[PDB]
UniProtKB/Swiss-Prot annotation, chain A:
It comes from Bacillus phage SPbeta. This is AimR transcriptional regulator. Keywords: Activator, Latency-replication decision, Transcription, Transcription regulation. It holds the Pfam family AimR. Transcriptional regulator which is part of the latency-replication switch system that decides at the onset of infection whether to replicate and lyse the host or to lysogenize (latency) and keep the host viable. Activates the transcription of the aimX locus. Transcriptional activation of aimX seems to lead to the productive viral replication (lytic cycle), aimX possibly acting as a regulatory non-coding RNA. NCBIfam families: lysogeny_AimR (NF038310).
Amino acid sequence: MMELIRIAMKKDLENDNSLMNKWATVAGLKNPNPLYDFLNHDGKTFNEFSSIVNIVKSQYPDREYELMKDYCLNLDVKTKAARSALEYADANMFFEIEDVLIDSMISCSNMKSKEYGKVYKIHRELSNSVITEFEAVKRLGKLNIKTPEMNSFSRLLLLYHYLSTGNFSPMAQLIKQIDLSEISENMYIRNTYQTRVHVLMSNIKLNENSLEECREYSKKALESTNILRFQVFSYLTIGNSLLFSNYELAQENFLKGLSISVQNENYNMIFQQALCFLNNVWRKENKWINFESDSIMDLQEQAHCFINFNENSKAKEVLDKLDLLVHNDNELAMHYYLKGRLEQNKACFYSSIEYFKKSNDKFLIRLPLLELQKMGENQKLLELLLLLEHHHH
Amino acid sequence: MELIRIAMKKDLENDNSLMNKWATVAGLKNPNPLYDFLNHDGKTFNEFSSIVNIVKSQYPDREYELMKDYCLNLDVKTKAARSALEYADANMFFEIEDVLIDSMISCSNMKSKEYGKVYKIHRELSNSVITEFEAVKRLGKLNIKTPEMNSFSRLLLLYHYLSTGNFSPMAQLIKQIDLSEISENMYIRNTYQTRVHVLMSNIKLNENSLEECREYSKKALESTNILRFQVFSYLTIGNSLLFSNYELAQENFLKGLSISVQNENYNMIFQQALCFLNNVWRKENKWINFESDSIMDLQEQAHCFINFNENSKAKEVLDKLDLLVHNDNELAMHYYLKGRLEQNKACFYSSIEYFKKSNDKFLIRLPLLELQKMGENQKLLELLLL
DNA sequence: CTTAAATATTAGGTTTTAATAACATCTAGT
DNA sequence: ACTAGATGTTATTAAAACCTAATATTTAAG
């Protein structure tokens, strides 16, 4: 079988012979002779996976998934190339590629490939709550990990668990034991894990309330990667670190995330909601509100446009719609915050804080608090509910 | 020839009635095994409680002396040694436990090897020699076979989850424990059952489920004759009451004091708990310690003086405390005392600050109560308790 | 004090699993 | 294409976990 990327490159090369020298620079090669091999010989892989990733990202950016899915799924799993494809798929959250590779690699006869798949299955199972952190780290001990790559990914997938649930305390200690410099086989994996650490470092500094460091680590992330997923969330993170303090710089960062995600439905919508919510927080005319949606979040942000602009009747219509819907803890907290501003009623604001606490939200909880501050309450106490790290001597 | 055997021989010569009584204490149908125990070096009982309950009944004031001699002489390749292990940890007899560990880790018995190795992980983990990631990784590589150690691997994590104060994944991890899967070693089963009650009480403590917390502490007290679990069950029940019911609180602290009379450390804990309880409730305080210059005892002098309007005498104490190294939890108290003494709300805000900096959802009531006295929004400082 | 039945413990012999390295393949670049 | 260098496979050995047999020890009735 010939892979789509090889068919593509053959056709493009026929219509443009200058491509071979240019692909060879994109691929890190000293001259393009491996690139003949690659096109003509089934099974030919390059020593590092970034050679085919950067060629795909440069010649066919709009088709990366289609070609990489076809490429990875015909890789012999016993090879370094395919180990590389596992991290590739996980990093971009291509779970249909990731999980097919994993099950092939777990029963394959190559000890490295088996080890890679096996800890990667653990990370999927843990992050889908099919097993427990306790069960998962046990299986990690039981595998008797040999490769530096999985040594480092075993601590990474835990940090990805701590982050999801919420337990931020031991992360700064756990991540500091990661030592990527011990990796010597797979520079693709090393360089992505380096991006991964930057992102994790960024989020840790976010919750330690060290926002300028948060922004530096996300900057380091962006400079370290060409992977949309990581780029997307570094801009998200940066903007959130600025959402309540610097309107124009947060909007600048959200728009940059919006621009690079025009073609990705999930990622474009994330920045749409963020811009909408940003502009509501700052009481601005809001081009981002979605009047054709009956989700809770979209509906909530309408009530916010309205309450912001003294359209009190029209905000009542939306909250009446909301009253009929399945609210969870964090969504009710927003409800109460909205109901509070509409009825100017401190008691809602209190319930708002209450359900933000219950849903362990140290971020949107600024909304009820600011409102109470504008109504004569004791700012010193309001600060203590938003329990921010203070950095004393 | 072990001391406890010697003591038993002598007391038997002077009271021949003891053989039948020891046998019921030990759960034997008849005391013929007790003869063997006295006549033959190396005789052990099917169940470790037999000798523990005897020792507790006839020699309650020499339990450490006699059990240390008895354990440290067992054959570590044996179920009496395994039992002796848990016994050692459960009473916090670390000099017994640790010696037992080094010898079972390299002994030829597969089962003792396994026990010794998961208790090494537990000591190392709780002494901060390894991390919990490293610890759990090793429990995986042991490929634990015995139900006993399957249960204790979850337990030693739950204690670390306590010491640090991760507190949250506790309630799902402890539910995974299934003590009924233990068939070999009933002593270990029953003390692990006490352990779970104790842990369940502390879980329900940090969910402010105080009536359930007192229930689990109760079930612990009924399930055990180990002074450790009894001391901390009574302390736990008092603290659960310390801000709502002065009398029932004191009654539990007093009860804890009476069983701890011969133990220096357990006695101090209860003197300090009574001292702080009465300072909380602004009573005359017969439990102050005027010779101790520890931060905690000095703090409570300041607290008593402030209670009784001797502000000048409490400033003398606070000046002495001003030049001693405070951690976050200690500093919180200091800001509490300074705020009461000075009638200064900013000191209370700071105290709430340093109370949340050590994740103390207990003693933080002190500043919150003072600000409610001073006119602040009760709905607001209700929220500070979450 | 014996001792038989039940329970624990130790060992002999087996299968699995894992570490070593000798051999073979594949890659990059002349 | 073909060579050095870097990776993959396989043959050979150690080993370590794993049962089933035998041996010891415990309880409680003689």
